[PDB]
Each structure stands twice: as C-alpha cells, then as structure tokens.
Nucleic acid binder design. Structure first.
Lengths: 259, 659
RNA sequence: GUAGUCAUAUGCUUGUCUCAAAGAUUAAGCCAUGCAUGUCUAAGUAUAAGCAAUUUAUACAGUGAAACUGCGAAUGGCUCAUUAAAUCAGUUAUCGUUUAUUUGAUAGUUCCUUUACUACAUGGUAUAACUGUGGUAAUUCUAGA
RNA sequence: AUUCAUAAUAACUUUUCGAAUCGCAUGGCCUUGUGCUGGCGAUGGUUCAUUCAAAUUUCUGCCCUAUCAACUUUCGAUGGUAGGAUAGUGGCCUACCAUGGUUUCAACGGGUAACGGGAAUAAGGGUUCGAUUCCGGAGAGGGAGCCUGAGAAACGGCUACCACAUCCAAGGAAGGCAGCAGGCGCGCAAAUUACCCAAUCCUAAUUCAGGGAGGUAGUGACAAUAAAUAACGAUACAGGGCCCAUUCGGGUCUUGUAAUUGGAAUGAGUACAAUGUAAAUACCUUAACGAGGUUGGA
C-alpha cells in the first residue's frame, strides 16, 4: 500500500465507541499512543459523545487547546483530539475535578466510571514483559506502556500491580493463578469479572484460561485477555454496571420488565 | 476613435505617423500599451518595437523609441516595412522640451555626433517640427492633452477619403523589355526606383517568364547580399556572387540586383558576356545617389523607372513624411526648380557657412544647407540620413560651398560643396590609433573631408581644390578614400600625405582604402603624419605582397615602435592585418624569431603565425591542423606572438604588457 | 378457440409527501473550459522607527510584511488493462526481515594533551531574506552589487 | 528454544554519540555584586518496545481438462555449499556441486477476460444487515534511468530518450487532469462547470491552517411515492313521475328551477422563530395575519 494509513471511516470505527452510524463519514482516528487503536477511546469521543461536555467538533478544539488545561489522564495534562485513553485509566476533568475509570461494559462498550478522590489515586497496571537491561538493572513493563525501574523481584511476567499515581509508587501486586479475580480486556467475553479456575498452558503457541463468578458461570478465554482485577476474591476497583456480570437476554428482561 | 480611423487607413492602403509626445512613462509607455490592445488592423497588430535584419517581413503597427535618441535610418527603414493600415507610433519626449531635449537627456543616438556626452540636436528637431506641423497628415498626441482631437476616424472628422486602394510592372516585364530590333536585342536594361517600387518583383518575373527551355535561362548576381529573397521568391534563379560569378558563361539574360553597389571594373566585364537587367534603389535610405547613378549609367543603357509602391497606395502620408524629413529628393542634378537649375553657370565663388544657417529661414536658411546636402548626397554611391543628422546638429561640422551667380534672394545653384567633419579629441579619428602606432593619435583634432562634390557639368575646373583651399584658408585635415592613382594625385595635389593603406578592397569600389593627412599644425600633427608615413614606408613591401592584388603603394607621391605594436597584438586586441601584412611588425618579428616561425610561430593564424603570414594558408586550413574551433586561431596567434617576444626579451615584454 | 393479455410493447397525458437514483457499464476513448498540498509560534530566525504598520521595551513591544523556515505533498482519488496468479481468504512469527508514528524511558565515565582548557561575559561561519544593478520573444528565467 | 540478551573484553574502527536551544517562570538560596535559583515546559539526542508498520509466513480455498502422464535440472529442478548482493530471509544470484524432487488426490499440464470477493436475529416463522466487491493484487504516452525519504517500484519527482506535441521578434521558449466536469467523439444509457466544509471526518505545524472529505441543495416518477383537493346544508316552485325489457304491463312516484338560505367554508399573502445547509434560517414545520369560483345520442 502507498505508505501508512492516516484516516478512519465512520463505518469502520469500533462498536465500542457506540458511534453515530448516520453521523458523518469519518471518525477521529486514535493517535499512536499507550493503547492500541481498537482498544482505546480518543478524547474527542470521550467528551463529545461520552460525557457530552463538548458537542460540535470545534467544541473540543477549544477545550484541549484552551490555555487553561481541562483534561488530565493519569495525573498528566493532555491536549490531543485523539489521545487513546485505554483500559484501567484515570481521567480527570480539571474545571470540575471529575475522576473517571476507562473500563469496558459487560456488553463491551467503553464506560466511564466515576471515582472518589480516593481511587483516583491508584490505577491498576498489568505486566507486559519483564527482563533485565543496562548495567545489571531490572525492568518491568505495563500494558499502559509504563516502563518500570527497580521493581519488586517477586513479580512474574503475567502480573497485575496497584499503582499510586500520586507517588508513582507500587503497592500490593498479585499474579494470575488459580483463585483470583479478573477482568477480561477483550474478547467474545469482555467486561466480565470472575474467579480464575485454572490456567492450562499448551505452549504450541496459545494458552487458555477458565473462570467462575456471581451466578457461577463458566468462562473461557486466552491469557492475553485476562487482567487481574484483584487477589483472592476481593476486587480492587468499583465496577460499572453493578458487578462485572452480564445477563441472558432472558435475565435482562426479567430484571427490567420482570417477565 | 483611432480604431475607426485605422479601418479607413487600411482600406485606403495608407499608413500614418502617430506621435506620442510626453513623459516617458506617461504618454509613452502606457499609451503604447493601450494602443496595442486598441488598435487592431487584424486582432491588434504585430507591433514590432524598434529601440537591418527585418526587411523581408512586413508588420502591422510598430513603435520607434526616440524618447532618448533618434536614429533616422532606423525610422525610415521601419516605415518601409509597415503594411497598409499600419500606424507607426513615434515615441518622443515632451514636445515643448524636445528641441532642447537632448543635452543631459541628450539624443542618445548621438552616434552621429559622437561626443563624449550626447547632445541636443535642435536643428533636426526644428526640421522635424516643420514637416510635422505643415499638414494635418500626422497625428500629434501630446500629454496634458486630456482629449486629443483626431481628424478623421469614425463619424465626420478630417481625412478626405482616398479611393479604396488595390500595370506599371506588366508594361515593363517583357514589354518594354522585348529587346529585339535593328539595334541589338541583347543589351543592358537598368530599372531604377525608390524602395518598395517592385524592382525586385519586376526582376523576379523575368526569371520564369523566360523558361529554362523555352524563353531561356537566366542568372543573378548581387553585392553583399541585399534581399535576394524577394526576387527569387518571385522567381531557375540561381545565385553566384559577382566575383565567383567571374567563372563561366552559361546564360542568355543576366540580372544584377543593385549593381551600383558593385565595382565598376568587375561589373563592366560581366555585362559584356551576356544581356542584363540592372536594378538599383534610389531616393531613400541606403540607396544610391542619382548623381553617381548617371556617371554609372554613362559607362554603358536602356533605363526604365517604376513609380508606384506595391505595398501601399501612392500618396501615403507616412512615406511623404519620411521623404521630406530625410530629404530623399534628388532634383538638383538634372535641374533646379526655379528659373535657374540644371547646369550652374557663372563664375564659381568659394565661401563658408556654419550650421547656424540651419535655423534661420530667410536668405541663408534651411534651403542653403538643404541644397548643399542634396548635392553631396546626390554624388555619393550610397545615401544615408546619418549624414543628414550629422550635417544638421553635429558639432564640428563645417561646410564650404562653390556657388554660381549670387545676387538677389534667388540665384543659381551650387557648383560644389565640401563637408568637413571635425574628428578627434569615425573613420580618420577611430582608426589612426587602432591602425597606427601612436596610442594617443585619437587625442588630437582634425577635420576629415567627408565629402566633396563638384556638379558634373562644372568638373575639372579646379573648384574642387578651391574648396579645400577655402577650408584651410581663413592638428590637420584628413581624408579616406578608395585608392586610385587618379584620386590620390588629386589629394596629393591638395597637399595631403599618405598615412595608411588597408587590407580589404572596398566592397563597393573594389579599391583599397587609403588615408591621407594635410598637416595643419606642426606641434604633433605633422609629426603624426610623417611618422605614420615612415611606418608605411617600412611596411610597403609587406602590403604589396599582402594585397594579393599586390598593388604597389605609390601613395600620393611618385624597431622600438614595432615592439609596442607587437605587444598590442600579443597583449591586446589589435588585429592581425594591422600588425601583419606581408611584413609589418609581425613578419618582421617572424624573421627575427627563432621559435616555431615556420610550422607554429612567425606571424598570423595558421602555423599559427607563419602558416598564415608566410604561407598564406587559409584560416580553415590551420584550424584543422592546429585543431582549433575557429576564433581561437586568433587567440593562438596572439599567444604565439607573446611567446616570441618573451624569448627575445623577457623584461621588455613584461613592461610592455603592463603599460 | 376464448380474450385477457394480472403481456406488453410505448404508443396518448393531469393535487399535496419524500426514505430520495442518474457516461463503473463502449475504450481502464483525456485533459476543452473550469479548475490545483502547502504551513505556525510560549516557536527558530525580522528594521534601534529604509518589511513597516502602529506605538514611547526601554537591549529586541507587539507586529506582521519575507524569508528562513520545519513540516506533509510516498497520503488519496479515479483506474483491470492485465492478471487462473495464493490474487485472495483464512491460515504463519518473523530465531530470519525492517520500522518515523507514539510514547515511554533515558545519557559520569569523552580531557584526561605534561587542565596560556584562553577563556564559554555559551564559536565560527556562513546566507538569505533582504537593498539594490540587470538582462532577455519571453521562463517557477535570470545575470552580475 | 541461544553462540539469545546484555554482558563484557580488548582491540579498531576517516564512526558515532553527546541541546553554542529557545520559552516563560527569577524569586528563593547567600553574597553583598555573587553562586546560583532554575522552575517549567519549547527545542532536541539516545537506544529499547511504543503502538506505526510492513514485510515476509505456515497452515484451508479459482472453472473445466487425463482427450492434461508425466513434470521440472545448464547454473536451478532440487539439495547443499562459498560469497555476494540485498536494509536486512530467501537459487535471489556468484559460484560449487548434490541429482533433485513435483505428480492419476491428474501432477507437467492444459482450457473458465479472471482483475478478482463482511451482520445478526433467529419455537417455527419474524426478518434482515454492512450499504454498485468489507476483502483484495496490477495504469497512470512509449521506454530508460534515476527522485522523496522513517517511509514510493514515487504515476501523478525528475531526467533523458523516444514519440506525440505547442508558442512564438526566431531565437528559443510547451505541453500527458481512468483525482473532475466539459465539447467532440463514443456515440447505449442517464442533473448547474449549485451551497457550505453548518456537521462529522480529514490533514496538519502550540491556532483554530487547511481540508475536493463530508455536507447541503436544487435538478431530478429518479423509483417514486403519497393519495388527501368544492361541497354542506335554507326556502319556494312544482310536472308527475319514472322505471321496467315493457312489445304492455308493471313499478311506484319528486323533479326542475340557468328560483330564494346558510359559516367570519377556503384558499392564497404577513411578521414567525425556527428542528435549520450557525449562512438553506423564510424554502421547510409552526404560528398566525389577514383571503372561495369515454363512448354511443340531437
């Protein structure tokens, strides 16, 4: 192909953005950042269609360009129409001191969870890779594309850390092993939260995992899609749509219109 | 406005002079832009801008930029090129200021005057104003004229309608031309006319009209080329120039275009072997004087003349304008228009008059100078307005006239005229220093006798010398002429001393041009004369051999300097022949030089220097051997000269190169 | 047979209402006429009132002219014309290959001259732009100051 | 999984590296000039992975055909190897040789103008989608070579060549819009060279650049739809009716006013802002203000 793509089509932009089909023809294309294209929510989407603080396109252009700084992502200022806010992030709306979790539904739509000045401090990080680099030093990396220097050594590659944004400090981690709580970042099963049952590795190039939860449903997904929302039953963050558990179309009806 | 008028003009086949006078930018430039868009004989016009190559073509509309300078020849030539409905837009300086205009502003075209700075030329402006002012024919648009009245044009305005314009040649082609009779059929015909008459076209007709097989085959010759294009285009025409022409005799009817230009010797011989049509232009710029034309004809002639222009209708006011401005009119040789005229009888009286005569119009007025001009101009082989302008405005112009009986305001015509042109401080004052030894020669002053002429009826009276004596009577005097044993003695008898004999036969006369000086002041002029004369003495052998014609230099009569000359060729631009001949300084140098004088050194282009100078090898020949591109040959010759000088004396050459 | 043709067939022609289609289809007939990827300051370059437009930073205000920049101008968009080919689909990580983009991170060992290291009160240039001098049927022309 | 790293390690590399940034923030520190104080970013570099990628790449699948039997090896048909290219994998080649091996499961091979093909519901049914190809290779006179660069087999960069193919003061000096429209043509076949970048998308340098995106129209049975547009009623006056199959019988009985009543029927203009082309935003939707004239048979 000519070179590298550079736009994005209304029609082609993820169902996670709950986008306007009739809308236009395009859609703000996520900027190369911390999260992958599909797994992200560009700010313009976050304020216009989400919060609804903005509206028309120029509305954003003001907000992120205005010399006041109205948007914060993980304790930092952002002024990019399409910064890819990803899973388990913390976004603050300066002018109102609003704090949000970037989390998927139970139906897989990006949801905004309101946090208390309390959780707004800690953010959950999942461990990408772990190896030693320059001059005998250990480095850990998080999905959030965080690069960590001198990390606690009791941390295996597929771990989950709790991060104190305020001090850029770590605390209480927890690997994925039979008996923990987890969130699935993507898949025919995303947005779910349950107890890890067991992890059968097949090495041939793809390991799998099982899970249980509230109504004790059986879940199946690939490791790469498991995010440890916590150690031993206690979750670490407040979940959207009540608990991370979806209902039969049948259970939804009976709960709402009670059929 | 003028666009309507333009329509009338092309319909009439006439042209008009549109004078734009005013500020350079204001009237001149902007108006020209507007006129181009507006005036459309066709859509717009070619509007060639002039500020020789152009003649075969014709153009609708043109502009002549006299704002700084006026070259009259160019103006006349430009007009001849313009088609029917065309307008010649003359760009002039502000009208009130024009006459004086020229000074600091100056007539830049002053190449006639050739003072360091250009000057006024008021007289010419005055003559111009007279012709322009005389009648309604020329349109004068002056600045600060919010509205200019345009006589003529759409609506009723001044310009009496001429008939739509659209036999003389036909009467002439075969017709006057059928040369068969008790008298010989083979003879020489000479058709003469002003420019644009159709002489060439007439001459072209005969070419085919005689058919190869059929009427017969023809031939054609001409001087330095001249537009061969019309004749042949109108035409078996083949062309071999006269000299090359001298080869073999094939044809029944020879045609020579503007033969007057060709040497009498060469021309005469050629006319003998066949039957010919002789064409010659007169009564215009770069034409031939009618006085000379008669002498030329006498050498034979069936002469015929064509009166009407092919390109425009007769009576074209533009053409009338230029003729009058330029003083095209010839009448004095046959006769003057008055009680007197024609031969000038009575005792000849010698007198001088100044340029000032030009302004006054009374006794001694524009007329006296005009008459003098007509006479000298008439007697010359070629006529040119540069002469006229020079006569009018140029400083340092002095005249002497030989006149017949003078009494009342109107008397008989002049017998003779002498035009002296100060020179110093072209021709006698440009070359004495390039060609001679003293770098300084250009500095002094002298008066060249540009033109001397005695009415043919009056000749051999001694009036000619009488004219010269009057010139001296009340640094030196000089003259340049085609060398003739006869003419030289005239000048020698005049008291001139032979200065130089150049290399190239006059293209027109066929004789080599010599220069002579009549020493007025001893301080340096007799010195320059004698010194040059001596130099010529040393050079004499060199010249004779070089001439090819190898004519010995009688002239009017029955070294360290060489080093300077040599350096000038080596270090500078002086030309080869100047240094070279068989043996001027250059051959002198080769004899002495141990170097390649032979195959490489000596003096000239070929073996670089020797092969051309000694061998007389062709430029083309040595360029090949030497493997030079051409032009480079001269450079090599110069380099060779430098080398020889250095070998002779390094220190001397260095100083000479330096200063 | 039946007429009809709920056959057309086109062949005749009339309030208020719109989710609203129209030289890929022929030849992958192209440029009439119309037309055309450049650009900004917290930010890199502007005149001690000849960019200069004010106005009085004031040793460098804006303010911009122009340039320098520095960027994209490998994007598409129309085009099978091909193509029986992995084209393409899945279906490969690439111990086999390259990588702007984006972050993240981030870098004490440069002498050690035999520290006038000079001494960094951070170098040198170079140039435009710029004033001008031009040229030429005439350039995205171009000359030379 | 490593000869992996990231180690070193020496050497030895015309080889790097390494903010002569600018921006506000200069008030705290001591000093008192000082030394700082740099704050903070802008402006860099560094390598790594950071998406960016591509780029390979196994592993299923184009029409028919055995009347395809056989195929493929001079340098590749194979292996394997030396190198060299390749940016970097590769017979890709330099070699150098291996003879390879493909194949009736038809292989060699042939023949199908072939450019080329995503959603979801759903007892059953209901239905439907993405939107004229999601997907996805090869053209931008011919040829050539070259171009940018993170990044082109660079169409729309060149050149130069060819060709066309053009302006001309003679001289030189053009020019390839299947990214549009347009006229020819073609000639099967279809609307002004609308309005805006109002969105929503685009690019993009620190803003609000620019967006031939997009949008908006119109045109436009286009396919069209819709299917709703003079009747409601006052009176008189009354001939007798008027129909039948009718042949005569029968049926019985309003019917004409080219008579006199009905509401301030209604249509059409006028602010009317406007979902509204922030301008289409008066054209919508209002609102009102006003305001009825085929046939046959003499």
């Amino acid at each position: 192909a000519r070179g590298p793509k550079k736009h994005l089509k209304r029609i082609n932009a993820p169902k996670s953005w709950m986008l306007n089909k009739l809308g236009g023809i395009w859609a703000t294309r996520p900027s190369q950042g911390p999260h992958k294209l599909r797994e992200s929510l560009p700010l313009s989407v976050l304020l216009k269609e989400r919060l609804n603080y903005a509206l028309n396109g120029r509305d954003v252009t003001l907000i992120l360009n205005d010399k006041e700084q109205n948007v914060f992502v993980d304790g930092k200022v952002r002024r990019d129409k399409g910064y890819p806010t990803g899973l388990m992030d913390v976004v603050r709306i300066e002018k109102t001191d609003q704090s949000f979790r970037i989390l998927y539904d139970t139906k897989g739509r990006f949801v905004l969870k309101s946090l208390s000045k309390e959780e707004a401090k800690y953010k959950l990080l999942k461990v990408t890779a772990k190896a030693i680099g320059p001059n005998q030093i250990p480095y850990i990396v998080t999905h959030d594309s965080r690069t960590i220097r001198f990390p606690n050594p009791e941390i295996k590659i597929g771990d989950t850390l709790k991060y104190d944004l305020v001090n850029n400090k770590i605390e209480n981690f927890a690997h994925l092993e039979s008996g923990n709580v987890c969130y699935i970042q993507q898949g025919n099963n995303i947005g779910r939260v349950g107890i890890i049952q067991h992890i059968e590795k097949h090495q041939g190039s793809f390991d799998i995992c099982h899970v249980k939860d509230a109504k004790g449903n059986a879940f199946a997904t690939r490791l790469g899609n498991i995010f440890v929302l916590g150690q031993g039953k206690k979750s670490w963050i407040e979940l959207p749509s009540g608990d991370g558990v979806r209902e039969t179309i049948l259970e939804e009806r009976k709960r709402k219109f009670s059929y | 406005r003028i666009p309507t008028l333009i329509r009338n003009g092309l319909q009439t086949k006439k042209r008009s002079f549109f004078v734009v006078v005013g500020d350079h930018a204001k009237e001149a430039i902007v108006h020209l832009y507007y006129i181009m868009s507006s005036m459309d004989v066709r859509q717009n016009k070619s509007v060639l801008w002039a500020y020789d190559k152009i003649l075969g073509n014709t153009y609708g509309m043109c502009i002549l930029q006299d704002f700084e300078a006026i070259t009259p020849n160019i103006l006349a030539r430009t007009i001849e090129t313009v088609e029917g409905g065309g307008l010649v837009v003359l760009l002039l300086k502000g009208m009130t200021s024009l006459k004086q205009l020229y000074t600091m502003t100056m007539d830049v075209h002053a190449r006639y005057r050739t003072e360091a700075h250009d000057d006024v030329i008021a007289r010419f402006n005055e003559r111009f104003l007279l012709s322009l002012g005389s009648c309604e024919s020329c349109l004068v648009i002056d600045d600060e004229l919010n509205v200019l009245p345009i006589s003529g044009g759409k609506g009723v305005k001044p310009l009496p309608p001429p008939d739509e314009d659209e036999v003389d040649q036909a009467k002439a082609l075969l017709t006057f031309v059928d040369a068969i009779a008790e008298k010989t059929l083979r003879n020489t015909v000479t058709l003469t006319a002003a420019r644009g008459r159709g002489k060439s076209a007439a001459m072209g007709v005969a070419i085919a009209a005689a058919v190869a097989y059929g009427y017969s085959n023809i031939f054609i010759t001409s001087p330095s080329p001249e537009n061969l294009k019309t004749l042949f285009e109108f035409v078996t025409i083949q062309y071999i120039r006269p000299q090359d022409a001298h080869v073999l005799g094939q044809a029944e009817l020879v045609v020579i275009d503007e033969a007057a230009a060709i040497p009498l010797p060469l021309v005469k011989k050629l006319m003998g072997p066949y039957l010919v049509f002789m064409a010659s232009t007169i009564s215009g710029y770069e034409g031939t004087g009618r006085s000379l034309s008669l002498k030329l004809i006498k050498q034979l002639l069936k002469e015929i003349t064509l009166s009407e222009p092919i390109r425009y209708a007769q009576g074209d006011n533009v053409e009338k304008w230029l003729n009058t401005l330029l003083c095209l009119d010839a009448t004095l040789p046959r006769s003057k228009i008055s009680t007197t005229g024609c031969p000038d009888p009575s005792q000849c009286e010698l007198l001088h008059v100044n340029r000032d005569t030009l302004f006054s119009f009374h006794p001694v007025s524009e007329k006296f100078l005009q008459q003098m001009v007509a006479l000298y101009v008439a007697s010359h082989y070629k006529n040119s307005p540069n002469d006229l302008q020079l006569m009018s405005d140029a400083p340092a112009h002095e005249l002497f006239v030989l006149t017949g009986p003078i009494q009342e305001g109107r008397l008989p015509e002049p017998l003779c005229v002498i035009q002296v042109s100060l020179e110093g401080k072209d021709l006698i004052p440009w070359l004495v220093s390039q060609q001679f030894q003293d770098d300084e020669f250009a500095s002094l002053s002298g008066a060249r006798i540009v033109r001397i002429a005695t009415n043919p009826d009056y000749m051999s009276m001694g009036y000619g010398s009488k004219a010269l004596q009057l010139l001296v009577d009340y640094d030196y005097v000089g003259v340049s002429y085609g060398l003739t044993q006869q003419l030289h003695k005239f000048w020698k008898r005049a008291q001139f001393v032979p200065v130089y004999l150049r290399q190239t036969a006059n293209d027109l006369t066929g004789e080599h041009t010599c220069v002579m000086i009549r020493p007025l002041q001893d301080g340096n002029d007799p010195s320059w004369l004698g010194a040059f004369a001596a130099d010529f003495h040393k050079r004499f052998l060199s010249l004779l051999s070089y001439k090819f014609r190898e004519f010995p230099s009688i002239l009017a009569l029955t070294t360290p300097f060489d080093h300077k000359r040599l350096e000038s060729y080596a270090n500078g631009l002086l030309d080869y022949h100047v240094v070279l001949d068989l043996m001027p300084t250059i051959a002198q140098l080769y004899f002495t030089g141990r170097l390649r004088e032979a195959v490489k050194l000596s003096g000239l282009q070929q073996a670089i220097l020797l092969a051309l100078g000694l061998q007389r090898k062709d430029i083309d020949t040595l360029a090949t051997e030497l493997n030079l591109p051409g032009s480079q040959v001269l450079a090599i010759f110069m380099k060779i000269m430098r080398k020889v000088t250095q070998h002779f004396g390094a220190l001397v050459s260095g100083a000479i190169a330096a200063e």
